[PDB]
Structure 1
Amino acid sequence: GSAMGSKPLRIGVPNRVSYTDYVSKDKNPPGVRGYCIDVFEAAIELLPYPVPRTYILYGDGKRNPSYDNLVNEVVADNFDVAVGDITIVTNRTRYVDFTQPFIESGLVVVAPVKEAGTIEGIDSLVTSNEPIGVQDGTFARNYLINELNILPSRIVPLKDEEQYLSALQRGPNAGGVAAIVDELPYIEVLLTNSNCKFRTVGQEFTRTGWGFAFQRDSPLAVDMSTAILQLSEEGELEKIHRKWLNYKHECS
């Protein structure tokens, strides 16, 4: 019979430095772990065919990588899929085939409790002209510039939870920010870890989700959407969420 085997699915995984319960490196095979990996694996197990595969980390592990650059590595055929906390953003849907979302997402504004009389939501944050913290690597920076009219110099990329907290505590006149703009899944973790000093202000002012980003016309994208809906019906998406994420804390 023919000697040459099939190439395995090349899975690109963002090498996250913050909010690592969503997805991160693992010292042990398969070399990655977290909520999005367990969902991906649970969905792979429901496909009606084997999927030989390997997980390849993307980023230097010092800062969160560019998620737009990770998605374009799929577009450029360096990976077959991007697996992780990959937001379903307009520009990315032009070039990859996302699954149906496996978790809902949306941007929120986070500010100190003491500041909520002047920063009440995205509209007051826009007109404040104060600095706005964001993660490294997120779609949110270009979203703020292009959709919310934020002057680019106002956007302050921050490395990790210690810096998210430091920047909010210092505030806008002492080298920090008026607010952080980030997706609600991350903020649920940040508020779990910050002793009731910060809160969301105003409406979740965008709505989308996270999906797995396959190449254009991939039959895996179709079959993994069906599998994600199966996990959702079975209660498995909720079980996997409970395994990795807990938003209960002491001060409330």
Structure 2
Amino acid sequence: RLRIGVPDRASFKEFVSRLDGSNKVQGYAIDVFEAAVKLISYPVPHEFVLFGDGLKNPNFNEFVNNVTIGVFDAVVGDIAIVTKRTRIVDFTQPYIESGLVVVAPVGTPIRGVDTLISSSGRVGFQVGSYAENYMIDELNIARSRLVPLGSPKEYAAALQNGTVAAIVDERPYVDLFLSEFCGFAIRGQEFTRSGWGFAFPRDSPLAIDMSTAILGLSETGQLQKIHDKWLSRSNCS
């Protein structure tokens, strides 16, 4: 029986979240995982364990580290495949493209990651995201400029009342945000490229077998249909 960690997301619950009146889980990443398990040649008995304080998204670096220390046999969620995590776990091949973008109010001076860096303005990020350490370590954005944000309603409010000048987050969250809230746009293109995967212990054969199962979902069209089930774009209006 695999003890599978699942993030107890406080927002963008479409990706993965607690089933409201229980300890059960649901979402895009859960449906991908359960669909993929059906295509594995051998049994993968499992149970899901929620991770997080229940008030804000968990820290995904700490979440993934729970596989390294044996608390979880695997983690399933909207987990970016970023270099420092691949040191301590084996990921599947990605099941969705993702990377960091800048989002700002339509008509902003900010044109992309370069004008964000040279700006004085505060920058929002999603609490628990690898974006926080990427901005501090790789882009050398002052920690004093970063504001944690919890939800798309908070993104819209922080951009509109000038708590932040811009938000850096991964494309899939930004796509849901822009489907709900008017007046904002992606500035520039992705400046990272790391999809989402599931994570297993170093040298786990399941990381490879689950890659083949994810590919099988892609080739049958199930993977696109699971995205359409949870993440269908719409008019902010």
Q: Is the TM value for this pair above 0.5?
A: yes
Q: Does residue 1:206 correspond to 2:192, yes or no?
A: yes
8 Å contact 1:15–1:57 — kept in the other structure? Answer: yes
* Alignment match, 1:4: none
Aligned residue in 2 for 1:128: 119
* Cα deviation 1:32-69 (Å, max 9, x = unaligned): 00000000001101011111110000001100000000
Preserved CA contact (<8 Å) 1:30 1:54: no
Q: Does residue 180 in structure 1 map to residue 167 in structure 2?
A: yes
Alignment of 1:49-198 (within 5 A): 49-115=42-108, 118-171=109-162, 176-195=163-182, 197-198=183-184
Identity of aligned residues (%): 57
Name the SS of the counterpart of 1:182 in structure 2: strand
SS in 1 for 2:228: helix
2:9 corresponds to which residue? 16
Shift in Å, 1:114: 2.8
| Structure 1 residues 86-130: Cα deviation after superposition (integer angstroms, max 9, x where no partner) | 000100000100000000000000000031xx1110100110121
TM-superposed CA distance for 1:165, in Å, is 1.1
TM-score (normalised: structure 1): 0.92
Query: In 2, are the aligned partners of 1:97 and 1:213 still within 8 Å (CA)?
Result: yes
Give runs of ≥4 in structure 1 deviating > 3 Å: 27-30
Closer, same or farther: CA 29–177 of 1 in aligned 2, 3 Å: closer
Counterpart among 223, 226, 237 of residue 212 in structure 2: 226
Higher gyration radius (CA): 1
- Alpha-carbon offset, residue 29 of structure 1: 7.1
Unaligned 5+ segments in structure 1 are: 1-7
Between Structure 1 and Structure 2, how many residues are aligned? 237
Counterparts of 2:236 and 2:165, CA distance in 1? 25
Question: How high is the TM-score relative to the length of structure 2?
Answer: 0.97
Residue of 194, 198, 201 corresponding to 1:215? 201
Give yes or no for the alignment of 1:248 onto 2:234. yes
